[PDB]
Design a protein around this ligand. Structure first.
Ligand code: ATP
Ligand code: CA
Lengths: 360, 436
């Protein structure tokens, strides 16, 4: 009783990797490669920031630099997981609407440079749904660099209904920097960037009623928190706690003229057949780190309720572990006996070259 | 065949003995729920308990043969009494299912509290909503669904159990809801229109294909529906439907990228849901197709001629199938009248040009009703609609204008898609077409 499949969730900001069967990813590091400002990957690249030039091979959920991507995979295999890829079937994740050639290239690299016995490429958003013990529903996946709405029916993600929003964690962090600086503070350097990133993950939240909440803050406290900087100097965060996440719903807070997450979720469903929409509205799962704000479920519930027919059952699935739902769904799926017949073997690969990854 | 004279009684009695009382009851609940889609869970259960009452008693060796036909006619007797405990009736297809599977937690909550109560509510609500699918499939799916809920809600790992079970149920679940959907469409149209509709949809999905490429497929699926939808065979649909996707892929696998992607899916039902949901493609811009000539219309064995017209037209007209189907059917039947009455070249001179404009008009109006729906997100579609409507009714108040956006938006969300519901949109396209 041994072998152990690997699950690698390649994210635009964070790569999540561990073993199938585990309840959580073994390693979680930033998707960055450091070149001589001789190369570093992940946390170390972050540290040696100054003497390095940082590249992000996965800007918007899609891999765009294959040399750097190999750097990352090599790193996660040997440094992070400290395993020998040659003896581990590997399950990979990809963004919705990932180009065929791109998927085939991931397969090529997997078999030809890391000689994995087998592997599979799965749609990130579908795994999120699976992580819930469901095969039908609409997923709002929102990470560091991109946000998607994916309607899925019995495992089938309807392509023409996919909604992609170029606004995610990275943008909220950047915005919370602008409004924090405007409130009479200074946040502009890269270290200040990570500080703000921390403030956002610990003290930000989504307001059920923006305006009401906005007045409550402008009137008194209770909506004010204190955060200790590395200086030891402590500051107070006011209405920026909810002004920050509020942009998910109002992309204009950053001058972006596009629908908010409640609207992309609404439109995705509307691109689907009338008879299944009910199943989308009643199984709306949220995954990704930018989906972690407290109150975001109740807010979405509210917004979709104002968009949908007054007779629709609206339900949001927002698990506490949703920051890793994709990875987790990958872990469960790869651990299924019924899934074992789904792997792409080195043989089937040798006898078919890439493109063999097309069977979804 | 069924010449039994007692066939019914010996049929049910046989079932009662083979399945046992519990299962016969479950079979009856599913059976009667698909028969009475608008029947209440209370009305249906009463009818079922009654039916199983007389069945157990009158199927017993010793029971006087006299009974079954007795309590059966007595059973139908109570059906006439006012406020009868049984389901009312003026069997129509359900184009808007309201069944919504609860969350895994709600399912298990309700299942721990009362299993039987849960099982019956699930079989009734599911059957009444997807009753158009073959009985053998409903009974099968239903039983397999409850089995899953029974083992996953007591599992150490409820979540992984559910994924595993749901993935294994996938095939039958699709086979069941898909067959219910397409059978509902077939029932609403009838063999004749259904075939026309399937050709139109196929045309809109693969505009660049040959008639001989898609016509066979449109005929096959129609044949399968005609034969399988209301069939007693436990394997008509189960066997026919997946066999149909193989042909479908054999013909269309390489015709365009969407069908190629769909044909790369792992299983037969994975491919069918894919092609079923596939939207109307970006149709080519082409010169109007002229109505069929008088010789074509009257000539014997002219089906091929009429099929090519439907195909050629459908692949170049940007209009939903529900629209095209309700116009092409009458248009042709009308042109058909000219062949009967003496003197062909005469009536075809009066009715001919009349039908052209009437069809041309109908299309332009339809294309107006479905404004920008296909081209954008619903949200953006509503913005544009509000704008073109503010330019067409300047003297309209913000409220009247707002009321109009909704009604037209609502209408479009229902009738401007390739799989818009037949019955509903037919009467709706009329009530909306006269508003020009
Ligand atoms: N508790 C939290 N509250 C708010 N944001 C959080 C929290 N935890 C993580 N995040 C944010 O969510 C984003 C990250 O993660 P995910 O792990 O979803 O990213 P990816 O998969 O790396 O990126 P993408 O999905 O955009 O390609 C980060 O930008 C991070 O700032
Ligand atoms: Ca991600």
């Amino acid at each position: 009783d041994e072998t152990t499949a690997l699950v690698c969730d390649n994210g635009s900001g964070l790569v999540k990797a561990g073993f199938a069967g585990d309840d959580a990813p073994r390693a979680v590091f930033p998707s960055i490669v450091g070149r001589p400002r001789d190369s570093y990957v992940g946390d170390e690249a972050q540290s040696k920031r100054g003497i390095l030039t940082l590249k992000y091979p996965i800007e918007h959920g899609i891999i765009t630099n294959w040399d750097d991507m190999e750097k990352i995979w090599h790193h996660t295999f040997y440094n992070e997981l400290r395993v020998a890829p040659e003896e581990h079937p590997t399950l990979l994740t990809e963004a919705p609407l990932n180009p065929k050639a791109n998927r085939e290239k991931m397969t090529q690299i997997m078999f030809e440079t890391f000689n994995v016995p087998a592997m599979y490429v799965a749609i990130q958003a579908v795994l999120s749904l699976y992580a819930s013990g469901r095969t039908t529903g609409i997923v709002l996946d929102s990470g560091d660099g991109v946000t998607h709405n994916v309607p899925i029916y019995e495992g089938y993600a309807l392509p023409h209904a996919i909604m992609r929003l170029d606004l995610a964690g990275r943008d909220l962090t950047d915005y919370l920097m602008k409004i924090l600086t405007e409130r009479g503070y200074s946040f502009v350097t890269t270290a200040e960037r990570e500080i703000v990133r921390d403030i956002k993950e610990k003290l930000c939240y989504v307001a059920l009623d923006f305006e009401n909440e906005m007045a409550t803050a402008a009137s008194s406290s209770s909506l004010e928190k204190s955060y200790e900087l590395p200086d030891g100097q402590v500051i107070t965060i006011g209405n920026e706690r909810f002004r920050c996440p509020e942009t998910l719903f109002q992309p204009s807070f950053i001058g972006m003229e596009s629908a908010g997450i409640h609207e992309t979720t609404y439109n995705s469903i509307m691109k689907c057949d009338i008879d299944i929409r009910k199943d989308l509205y009643a199984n709306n799962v949220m995954s990704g780190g930018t989906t972690m704000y407290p109150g975001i479920a109740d807010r979405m519930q509210k917004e979709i309720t104002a968009l949908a027919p007054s007779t629709m059952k609206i339900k949001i699935i927002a698990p506490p572990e949703r920051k890793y739902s994709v990875w987790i769904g990958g872990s469960i799926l790869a651990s299924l006996s019924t899934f074992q017949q789904m792997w792409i073997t080195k043989q089937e690969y040798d006898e078919a070259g890439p493109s063999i990854v097309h069977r979804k | 065949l069924e010449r039994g004279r007692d066939y019914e009684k010996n049929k049910v009695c046989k079932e009662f003995s083979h399945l046992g009382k519990e299962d016969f009851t479950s079979l009856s609940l599913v059976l009667y729920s698909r028969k009475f889609p608008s029947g209440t869970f209370e009305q249906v259960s009463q009818l079922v308990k009654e039916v199983v009452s007389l069945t157990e008693a009158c199927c017993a060796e010793g029971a006087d043969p006299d009974c079954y036909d007795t309590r059966t006619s007595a059973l139908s007797a109570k059906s006439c009494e006012s406020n009868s405990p049984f389901p009312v009736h003026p069997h129509q297809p359900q184009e808007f299912p309201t069944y919504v599977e609860p969350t895994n937690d709600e399912i298990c909550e309700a299942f721990r509290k009362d299993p039987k109560e849960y099982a019956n509510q699930f079989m009734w609500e599911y059957s009444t909503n997807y009753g158009q699918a073959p009985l053998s499939l409903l009974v099968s799916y239903t039983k397999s669904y409850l089995s899953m809920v029974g083992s996953c809600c007591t599992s150490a790992s409820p979540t992984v159990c559910f994924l595993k079970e749901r993935l294994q149920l996938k095939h039958l679940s699709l086979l069941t809801t898909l067959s219910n959907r397409v059978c509902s469409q077939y029932a609403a149209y009838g063999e004749k229109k259904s075939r026309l509709s399937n050709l139109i949809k196929l045309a809109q999905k693969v505009p660049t294909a040959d008639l001989e490429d898609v016509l066979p497929l449109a005929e096959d699926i129609t044949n399968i529906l005609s034969k399988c939808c209301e069939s007693a065979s436990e394997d008509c649909m189960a066997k026919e439907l997946p066999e149909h996707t193989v042909k479908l892929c054999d013909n269309l696998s390489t015709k365009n990228s969407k069908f190629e992607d769909c044909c790369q899916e792992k299983t037969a039902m994975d491919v069918f849901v894919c092609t079923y949901f596939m939207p109307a493609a970006q149709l080519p811009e082409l010169p109007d197709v002229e109505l069929p000539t008088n010789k074509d219309v009257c000539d014997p064995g002219n089906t091929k001629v009429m099929d090519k017209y439907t195909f050629e037209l459908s692949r170049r007209t940007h209009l939903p199938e529900v629209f095209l189907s309700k116009v092409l059917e009458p248009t042709l039947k009308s042109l058909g009248e000219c062949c009967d009455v003496e003197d062909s070249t005469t009536c075809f001179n009066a009715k001919g040009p009349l039908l052209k404009k009437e069809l041309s008009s109908f299309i332009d109006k339809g294309q107006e009703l479905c404004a920008d729906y296909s081209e954008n997100t619903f949200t953006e579609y509503k913005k544009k609609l509000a704008e073109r409507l503010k330019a067409k009714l300047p003297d309209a108040t913000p409220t009247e204008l707002a009321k109009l956006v909704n009604k037209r938006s609502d209408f479009a969300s229902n009738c401007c898609s390739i799989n818009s519901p037949p019955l509903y949109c037919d009467s709706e396209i009329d009530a909306e077409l006269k508003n020009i």
